[PDB]
């Protein structure tokens, strides 16, 4: 019937004055665009069909052609920026927003999907969707006493589209729109469906990536405890965005970080710092580095949860990027910590793995490690233990590496290493 039509046939059917022929041709187009291999998006665009599909969106009297043209346009907007732009240039945004109020749930769902793709292109189309007024009808779709009454797929598509309205930077979404969306996001963040939870966590992670004022908007809604709970989920697709959000949050002020600590996040980190997914270990160690950049009481809470041996472990054996984040964690720790906390760090066996990392090719991590070693030596100076630390660094073969760094291409490395060997290692 409508299977395997040529673009030529589709054009001939859409250009007839027969509404049913147009319906058949539009369904054929939808089926072309929903095939698994190489959907002919550009051929459909070049045929001039987008304006006709957009016009079909407004045929309230023919519900099926509304649905079919909505689906076809959704799939065109799913492609490149140019193809999405072609959909927007056809006037599709206000037409889809009008469909959001359709009495047919499959048609409003399809409009939700289309707006999601359009907004997902980037900041400009996101803000253009917001300017046309999509947020009010979108949120109205979710204004029900219990989300569990909504169809699973309907709710999932709504959540994903909302997440796309929170997505992208330069610029971030309008602050007023974020304020309008956040309550519904919190509600979705407490829903029992894993996909809804994943997309809500992604939305929160987008909103928390920016200046501390944005983080404050999110944190004021009290979502941090729920984020920690989700940080402990079995579903990796949930843990990943939850951990991203928690990290973003701890990039902010010390009080915002303390909200994460008080919610119990640190208790989850023994798993995260040994998680078998490299990305999880990397994100978790980055989060750790930003916590050890906090107050001394926050460093102390890191100590109390027994996380220092886990940092020693990550520094000893892990993907190199994770090791780089761990080096940052150590340098922040040693710069902000007390002498007692730095001594504890040394008693956990930081020196040997720290030295093994001085043979690395990355120049920046060398700078970081030399800064950490310097900090530890300042603590030792306060205790008169500089000589014991010198011996300890020598016995594991570290002095050799430090000396070899004197003859290094980078100037900062040169200065730091020469200063270290001159002031401590004779």
């Amino acid at each position: 019937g409508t299977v395997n039509w040529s673009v030529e046939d589709i054009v001939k059917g859409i250009n007839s004055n027969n509404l049913e022929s147009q319906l058949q041709a539009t369904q054929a187009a939808r089926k072309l665009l929903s095939r698994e291999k190489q959907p002919p998006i550009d051929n459909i665009i070049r045929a001039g069909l987008i304006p006709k599909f957009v016009s079909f969106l407004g045929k309230t009297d023919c519900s099926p052609i509304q649905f079919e043209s909505a689906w076809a346009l959704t799939n065109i907007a799913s492609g490149t920026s140019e193809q999405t732009k072609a959909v927007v240039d056809g006037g599709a945004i206000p037409a889809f927003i009008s469909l959001l109020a359709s009495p047919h749930a499959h048609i409003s769902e399809q409009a939700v999907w289309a707006l999601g793709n359009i907004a997902g292109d980037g900041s400009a189309f996101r803000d253009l969707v917001i300017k046309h007024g999509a947020i009010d009808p979108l949120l109205a779709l979710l204004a029900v006493p219990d989300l569990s009454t909504l169809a699973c797929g309907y709710l999932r598509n709504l959540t994903w589209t909302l997440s796309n309205l929170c997505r992208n930077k330069n610029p971030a979404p309008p602050l007023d729109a974020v304020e309008q969306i956040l309550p519904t996001l919190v509600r979705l963040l407490h829903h029992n469906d894993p996909e809804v939870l994943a997309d809500s966590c992604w939305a929160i992670s987008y909103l928390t990536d920016g200046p501390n004022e944005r983080i404050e908007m999110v944190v004021k809604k009290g979502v941090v405890p729920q984020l920690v709970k989700l940080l402990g989920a079995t579903e990796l697709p949930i843990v990943t965005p939850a951990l991203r959000a928690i990290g973003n949050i701890v990039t902010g002020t010390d009080e915002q970080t303390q909200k994460v600590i008080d919610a119990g996040a640190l208790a989850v980190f023994p798993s995260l710092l040994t998680n078998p997914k490299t990305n999880i270990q990397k994100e978790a160690t980055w989060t750790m580095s930003n916590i050890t950049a906090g107050r001394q009481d926050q460093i102390q809470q890191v100590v109390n949860h027994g996380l220092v041996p886990f940092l020693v472990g990550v520094l000893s054996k892990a993907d190199f990027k994770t090791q780089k984040e761990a080096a940052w964690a150590i340098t922040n720790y040693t710069s902000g910590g007390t002498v007692e906390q730095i001594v504890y760090l040394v008693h956990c066996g930081i020196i040997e793995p720290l030295m093994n990392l001085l043979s690395a090719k990355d120049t920046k991590i060398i700078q970081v490690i030399l800064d950490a070693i310097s900090n530890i030596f300042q603590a030792a100076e306060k205790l008169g233990e500089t000589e014991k630390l010198s011996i300890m660094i020598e016995e594991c073969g570290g002095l050799d590496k430090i000396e070899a760094l004197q003859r290094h291409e980078n100037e900062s490395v040169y200065k730091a290493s020469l200063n270290l060997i001159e002031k401590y290692f004779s």
Partner: peptide, 19 residues
Amino acid sequence: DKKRKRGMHGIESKRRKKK
């Protein structure tokens, strides 16, 4: 001391419907 993400993988921003 605090380092932000941009300083120096996500889900797909677009979804094609195949149903």
